[PDB]
Structure 1
Amino acid sequence: ASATRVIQLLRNWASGRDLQAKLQLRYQEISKRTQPPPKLPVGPSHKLSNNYYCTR
């Protein structure tokens, strides 16, 4: 956060905890908004043999 050391110390004392560690606002730890393309797997019935529907 863009908070000065005096303000950070006052905030931590008033709260009683280290707020600068577990900040609620998200800055950079979020995942990227442009993720690589995926490749999802097929299910257990995507086989060319021994897969008659009467058995499942």
Structure 2
Amino acid sequence: ASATRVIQLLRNWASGRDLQAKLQLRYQEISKRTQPPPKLPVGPSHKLSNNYYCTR
């Protein structure tokens, strides 16, 4: 956050814990909104042989 150090001390004292360690707002540690494409593997039944439907 962009809070002044004295305000951080006042907040920490009032709450009783270290607030800057766990901020509710998300600044930069989140995932990027543009991602590479996936590959998404296939299931067990995607075989070419020994895959008769009556057995499964």
**TM-score of the superposed pair, with normalisation by structure 2:** 0.98
Displacement after TM superposition at 1:5 (Å): 0.3
Aligned length: 56
**TM-score of the superposed pair, with normalisation by structure 1:** 0.98
Name segments (4+ residues, structure 1) moved above 6 Å: none
Aligned Cα root-mean-square deviation (Å) = 0.4
Show structure 1 runs of 5+ residues with no match: none
Higher normalized contact order (CA 8 Å, seq sep 6+, divided by chain length): 2
Show structure 2 runs of 5+ residues with no match: none
